Amino acid sequence: TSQIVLPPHLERIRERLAENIHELWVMNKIELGWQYGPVRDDNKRQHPCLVEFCKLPEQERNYNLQMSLETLKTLLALGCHVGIAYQLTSGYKPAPMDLSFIKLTPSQEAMVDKLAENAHNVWARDRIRQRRNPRLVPYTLLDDRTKKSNKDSLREAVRTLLGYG
């Protein structure tokens, strides 16, 4: 996917979808009960990467930025075209829109499945350097129980792409 020059006409959309992925990375943790703390912990139910997008430094926004780039590049590589068409937290207000109403077509569902397969392949190729975790198998050879979580995580990119027009 990285062999595709990213068109700057939709860099603003790649940043909107990056901000959306970041705000949902806040959303799920706050559903689990995570606040905004200055210590990078997981058992202390706090996360220092929940603040507004503009205040996020280069050490915290690159994850969502690269995630958006790779999903869009995977879309363009597969062949379809991209173009023109509450729980009170501890300081942040993640609420883009009601993006869970319009039914997502089976083509987009398979597209999100392919995105999850690619992301899992990258993560497994990174993980093989460590021992012998049962998740070192490809996504096609992965247990079906956790397949839906990765497909759900990748569904929001195409959901934002469709909803924003």
Distance CA 30, CA 55 (A): 19
Distance CA 154, CA 151 (A): 5
Distance CA 46, CA 34 (A): 5
Q: Residue 106 in contact with residue 96, Cβ under 8 Å?
A: no
Q: Residue 41 in contact with residue 85, Cβ under 8 Å?
A: no
Task: Collect contacts of 18-22 with beta carbons under 8 A, ≥24 apart.
Answer: 18/61, 18/64, 18/65, 18/67, 18/68, 19/53, 19/64, 20/96, 20/156, 20/160, 21/64, 21/67, 21/68, 21/156, 21/157, 22/49, 22/53, 22/56, 22/61, 22/63, 22/64
* Resolution expressed in Å: 3.8
Encoded amino acid at 145, one letter: R
Distance CA 154, CA 92 (A): 23
Exposure string for 63-82, b = 16+ CB within 10 A, e = fewer? ebbebbbbbbbbbbeeeeeb
DSSP reduced 3-state for 35: strand
Residue 88 is encoded by which pair of tokens? 């009170």
Task: Collect contacts of 90-94 with beta carbons under 8 A, ≥24 apart.
Answer: 90/35, 90/36, 90/50, 91/36, 91/50, 91/51, 92/23, 92/26, 92/36, 92/50, 92/51, 92/52, 94/23, 94/24, 94/26, 94/27, 94/30
Distance CA 43, CA 69 (A): 31
Residue 158 is encoded by which pair of tokens? 């195409």
Residue 65 is encoded by which pair of tokens? 């930025």
Determined by cryo-EM
DSSP letters, 36-65, are --SS--STTSB-SS-S-TTT--HHHHHHHH
Residue 76 is encoded by which pair of tokens? 């363009």
Find tokens 């690619």 and name the residue.
118
